[PDB]
Amino acid sequence: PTKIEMRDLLQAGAHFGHQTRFWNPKMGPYIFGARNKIHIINLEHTVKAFNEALNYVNGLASKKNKVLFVGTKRAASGIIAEQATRAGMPYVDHRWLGGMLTNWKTLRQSINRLKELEKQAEDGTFAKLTKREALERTRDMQKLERSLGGIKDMGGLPDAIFVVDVDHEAIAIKEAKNLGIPVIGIVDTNSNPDNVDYIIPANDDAIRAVSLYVTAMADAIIAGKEYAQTQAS
Amino acid sequence: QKVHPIGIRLGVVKKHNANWYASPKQYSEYLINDIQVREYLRKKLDSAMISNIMIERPTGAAKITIATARPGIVIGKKGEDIERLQKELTKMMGVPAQVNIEEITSPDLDARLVADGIGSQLERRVMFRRAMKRAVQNSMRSGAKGIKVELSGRLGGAEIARTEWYREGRVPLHTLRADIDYASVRAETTYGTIGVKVWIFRGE
Amino acid sequence: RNYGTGRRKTSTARVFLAKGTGSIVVNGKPLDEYFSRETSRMVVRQPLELLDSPTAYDLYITVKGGGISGQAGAIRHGITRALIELDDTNKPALKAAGFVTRDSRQVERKKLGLRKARKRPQFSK
RNA sequence: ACAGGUGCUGCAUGGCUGUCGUCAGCUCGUGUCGUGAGAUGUUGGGUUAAGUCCCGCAACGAGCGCAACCCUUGUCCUUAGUUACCAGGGAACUCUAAGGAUACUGCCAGUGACAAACUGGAGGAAGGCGGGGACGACGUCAAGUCAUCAUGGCC
C-alpha cells in the first residue's frame, strides 16, 4: 500500500487536466504538456508525490494520529463516507462549516447535542414525547447528523487534514494554515497549490480517480494501524 | 411601559400573597389593616434581609408568614424578639395574631433580597457597575437560570440621569409560565434617588 | 321521541321529533302567533322544505332567551339536530346546506377607548 | 430642635404612562475580514400574520422580541340537581361551575429545488391564526407627571 502503481492512475484518468484558459502558472512543472487545449499532468511527478504522501500517512497511522477527510464535491462525498468508515478516521462530506477547526470550541456544543440526541433516540425517549415533537426532534437530529456526523467522534483537532479539490476547499486550507496543522491535498491544474505541506497534482473531476486516491489513502492508514497492533502483541 | 410580571402571573402560575375572604363592607377595612401591617413590618425589619411576606387573616386572630434569609436574629434568643414584635402587632390590630417564620434555602434566588443588597451597596457608595456585576454573578453561581438588573438615575453623581441594564441568561418576560420574580427597591443616595429593578427567572 | 338542542347567538331551543300530524307549537303557543315576522317563520320552516317533509313529523318547541330573529334560527338548528339524530343519510345533504352548523357569531366586546366594538372617535383638523 | 408647603425645578431624579408599534425589529459570544470606523452572522432563491419556517452561504450559536403558555366564548363529555330545570311528583333536557375531549395541514388530491409551503376536497360544531381580549423588544421624542406618592437641590 505504501507504493502506488503507475499504470492504474493512467487508467483512472488522473493525467487529464483543466482547459488552458484557466491554467495556473505555478502548477507548470507538474504539467508535462497540453493536447487539444487540455493540460496533461505528468505521471512521474504525481507518482513520486503520492509515494511520499503515502509514506507520511502510514507513519501517522503507526502512531494512531487522527487524520481528517474532506469530501465536499458531490462525487467525492459518498466515496469519502465509505472509505472513512472503513479507515476509522473522521470525515465531512456534505458541507464544510466555516471555521470548523478554528471555532471548534463552539462546535463542541453542537457535537454534544448530536450525541445526546442519539442517546435519547437509543434509550427509547420518543415514546414519552408527543408524536409531532418527536418528529421535529428527529428532523433536527438528521440535519445535525449530516453536517457533524463524521467529525462527532474526533474529540479533538486533527493532526493532519486530507483534502480533494483544493480550489473549492480553499477555506479549510486557510483554517489549516492558521492552525499550522499539516495538510495533504490533491490539487488539479486550476487549483492553487500554495499553503499545502504536500501536493498531489491529480485530476479531481473524475469519480474513478477520486475513488482510486481515497482507496489508496485508506489502505495506507489501515496497514499502519495493524502494524501498530503488532507492537502491542 | 412594561407590566408588572407578578400581576400577570397571578392568574395561572402564581399564588396571591393575601388570601382572605370578606364581605363588601368588611373588605374595605380588612385591606387597610393588611396594608398598615405590611408597611409597619417593613419599616421595623428594614435592617434585616427579608423576602416577600404572606399574610392570611381569618375572622378574629390574624396569621402572618414571613420568609427571611436571616431567621436567627428575627427570632431572637428563645423567641424574645418575635414575642415583642408580636405584642406590638397585637396592639396595633385586634384579636391576638400569630406569626411564623420559614427559612429560605437560597437568598440569591429571591428577587427582593438581591435588590435590598444592591440598594445597600448604592447607599454605601459602592460603584453601581461593580454592584450589578457581583449581584448578577452570585445568582449564576447559585444556579438561578436567569438574572437581569436595571439601574435608573444619576449613577455616580452624574448631572444627567442614565439607565444601565445587564442580562445574563434567558429571561423571557412574555412567557407567563416563566414564574419570573420581580421586586423593586429605592436606594437613598445623597446626590439623588436611584431606582433598582431585579428580574430573576428560575424556570417554569 | 327524539330530542335535540340548538342555539343561535344567544338563545337555546329544545326540539322534539316524533311521527304525527305535523302541527308545530312554539313555547306552548302556535308558531304563527308566536312569530310576528315572515322572515322568522321562513327560518323556522327552512329545513323541512329542503327535503319536502313539512308535516311528516310532529314538532314540540320551547325556546327561551335571546331575541325574535335568533330564536327562529335556534329552532331551525334544533330541528336539524333532531333530524340528523333520527337519520344518518339526511346529514350529508343537510350539511351541503349547512343548517347543521351552529352560529359562532355573537355580540363582541366593546374595546375601551372605542365607542363601539370598532367605532373610534373621529378627529377633525 | 422642628413640623409644615398642592411653593420652584419632570432640563437633577425614582416609580408610572403616551408614542413610533403588536411594526418585525434590536442585538451579543466565538470564529473570519479590514490599519481603521466597522463587515459577516441578520445577506441570497422560495415562504409566511412574523428575523414564521426551509435550502444554500465563512459563518457557528445565543438572547430578546414573533409564535407558544393564560382569559373568553363556539360543539361534546364527567361531576353535582338547589333558591334552577318538570320530558314523562322526576332528573332526562336547559342552565349554572370545577374538570377534561377535540384541531394537529391529522387525511385525499394536486403545484412545488423530491423542501418549507401553498391550492382545492372529505369529515367535523369548528381548517389552516376559528373570533375577541390580555401580553407593548433595544430604543425615539430632555414626550406627560415635584398636584397620587417618593427623593436631590432651592426657597
Cβ partners under 8 Å of residue A10, min gap 6: A43
Measured in angstroms, what separates residue C7's CA from nucleotide D97's C1'?
20
With cell 364581605, the residue in question is: B23
| Integer Cα distance of C61 and C16 in angstroms | 7
DSSP A46-91: HHHHHHHHHHHHHHHHHHT--EEEE--SHHHHHHHHHHHHHHT--E
- Extended strands (E) in chain B: 50-56, 63-68, 98-103, 146-152, 164-168, 181-188, 193-201
A8's enclosing H/E stretch is: helix A6-12
In a 3-state reduction of DSSP, which class is residue A157? coil
Chains touching chain C, criterion 3+ CB pairs below 8 Å: none
Measured in angstroms, what separates residue C7's CA from nucleotide D120's C1'?
31
Angle between helices C90-97 and C38-50 (to 10 degrees): 140
| Integer Cα distance of A53 and A175 in angstroms | 21
Per DSSP, A42 falls in state -
Give me the C residues in range 41-70 that sit within 7 A (CB) of strand D: 62, 64
Give yes or no for CB of B202 within 7 Å of strand D: no
Residue B25: all three cell numbers together: 363592607
Give yes or no for CB of B101 within 7 Å of strand D: no
Measured in angstroms, what separates residue A70's CA from nucleotide D36's C1'?
36
Cβ partners under 8 Å of residue B122, min gap 6: B128, B131, B187, B189, B194, B196
A132's enclosing H/E stretch is: helix A131-148
What dihedral angle (degrees, nearest 10) is formed by the CA atoms of B153, B154, B155, B158? 160
SS3 labels along C12-63: EEEEEEEECCCCEEECCEEHHHHCCCHHHHHHHHHHHHHCCCCCCEEEEEEE
CB A202 within 8 A of CB A188: yes
B153 nearest nucleotide via C1' and CA: D13
How many CB atoms within 10 Å of residue A220? 24
Give yes or no for CB of C101 within 7 Å of strand D: yes
- For strands C57-64 and C24-26, give the pairing: parallel
In a 3-state reduction of DSSP, which class is residue A40? strand
Measured in angstroms, what separates residue A110's CA from nucleotide D60's C1'?
9
CB A220 within 8 A of CB A2: yes
Per DSSP, A34 falls in state E
CB A167 within 8 A of CB A192: yes
| Integer Cα distance of A37 and B71 in angstroms | 91
Q: What are phi and psi of A160, to 5 degrees?
A: -130, 150
Residues before each break in chain C (C–N > 2.5 Å)?
A: none
Strand order in the sheet with B181-188: B164-168, B146-152, B193-201, B181-188
Burial profile A4-28: b = 16 or more Cβ within 10 angstroms, e = fewer: beeeebeebebbbbbeeeeebeebe
Angle between helices C90-97 and C68-86 (to 10 degrees): 150
Cβ partners under 8 Å of residue B150, min gap 6: B163, B164, B165, B166, B196, B197, B199
DSSP C51-114: TT-SSSEEEEEEEESS-HHHHHHHHHHHHHHHHHHH-TTHHHHHHHHTTTSPB---PPP--TTS
Nearest to B6 by CA among B73, B72, B56, B52: B52
- For strands A38-41 and C2-8, give the pairing: unpaired
CA C6 to chain centre: 6
Cβ partners under 8 Å of residue C26, min gap 6: C34, C35, C44, C61, C62, C63, C75
First to last CA, chain A: 22
Give yes or no for CB of B146 within 7 Å of strand D: yes
Give yes or no for CB of B177 within 7 Å of strand D: yes
Q: What are phi and psi of A197, to 5 degrees?
A: -60, -45
Measured in angstroms, what separates residue C5's CA from nucleotide D121's C1'?
30
Measured in angstroms, what separates residue C106's CA from nucleotide D107's C1'?
32
Q: Partners of C97 in the beta sheet?
A: none
Strand order in the sheet with C11-19: C2-8, C11-19, C57-64, C24-26, C29-30
A198's enclosing H/E stretch is: strand A198-200
Cβ partners under 8 Å of residue B183, min gap 6: B52, B111, B112, B115, B198
Per DSSP, B110 falls in state S
Give me the B residues in range 147-176 that sit within 7 A (CB) of strand D: 150, 152-154, 159-161, 163, 165, 167, 170-176
How many CB atoms within 10 Å of residue A218? 25
Residue B24: all three cell numbers together: 363588601
Give yes or no for CB of A141 within 7 Å of strand D: no
Give yes or no for CB of A98 within 7 Å of strand D: yes
Measured in angstroms, what separates residue C116's CA from nucleotide D94's C1'?
31
Measured in angstroms, what separates residue A165's CA from nucleotide D112's C1'?
33
Give yes or no for CB of B11 within 7 Å of strand D: yes
CA-CA distances (angstroms) from residue A172 to A70, A162, A184? 9, 10, 12
| Integer Cα distance of B159 and B81 in angstroms | 44
Residue B120: all three cell numbers together: 445597600
| Integer Cα distance of C75 and C16 in angstroms | 11
| Integer Cα distance of C15 and C5 in angstroms | 6
B128 class by beta-carbon count within 10 Å (0-12 exposed, 13-18 middle, 19+ buried): buried
In a 3-state reduction of DSSP, which class is residue B88? helix
